[PDB]
Amino acid sequence: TYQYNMNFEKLGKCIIINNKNFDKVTGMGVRNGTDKDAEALFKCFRSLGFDVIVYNDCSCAKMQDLLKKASEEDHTNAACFACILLSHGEENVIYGKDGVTPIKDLTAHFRGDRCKTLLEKPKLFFIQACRGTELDDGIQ
Amino acid sequence: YKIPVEADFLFAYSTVPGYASMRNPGRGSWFVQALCSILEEHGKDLEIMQILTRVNDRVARHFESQSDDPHFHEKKQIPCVVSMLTKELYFSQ
C-alpha cells in the first residue's frame, strides 16, 4: 500500500521533446549537444519498459497539441506516464522554436480531472532548460 | 473517495528556480548525462527519489564549468525535484 501499483500490461508512454533549432526572432541559439541528450534518454527509458517517442524542433502549438492528445489517450493499461523536455527556458516557461509557453499549461493536460485514465498514477516530467540567468559560483 | 487533481505529479528540473542550466555541446547537458548514467546503473532497483537524489549529488560533485569567458567560469549547478507523489515509485516488479 506504500508503493505505486506497477502491475499493468505496459509501463507507459515516454514523450521526449527535443528542441534544438529555434527561429532567429526568439534570439535563442542552437542547442548543441541536445541530440546526445535525446539519444541517451531514448535508450534509457526504452530499457525501463516505456513506449518511447521522440519529437524534434517543436513549435509551442505543436508541444501543446502533442501533450493534449497524449492526455486524451487511454492510459488504462499503463502504470505511469513520463515526459521529458529538452529546450531553452526561463522561469516557469519553456521555449518552442517559435517562442515560449508556460510549463504549467503543458502539464495541466494530465491533471486528475483532465486525464482520468492516469488517475492515482505517477506523472513524471523531466525538464532540461534554464530557469533564469543566475549562475552558481559554488564554494569550497 | 476523491483525490486532488494536482496530485501524483513529479517534476525533475535540471536546476533551481532563477538559475541557468549547463549544456556541454560535446557530451550533452549535465543533468541528462547524470540522469541517464544513474538510470542505466540503478533504474531497476532504486526508488525514484533515491535515483534523483543521486542525480542531484552527481551534478553537484562531478561537474564544474569551464569557459574562457569569465562570466561562465568556475560555475556550478544543482537540480531540483518537486514531488507531489503519494507513493514510492519503482520501475519494476
Binding site: 529546450s87 | 542550466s21 549547463m22 547537458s29 569557459s67
Partner: peptide, 4 residues
C-alpha cells in the same frame, strides 16, 4: 560550456 553553454547555457540553456
Amino acid at each position: 560550456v553553454e547555457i540553456x
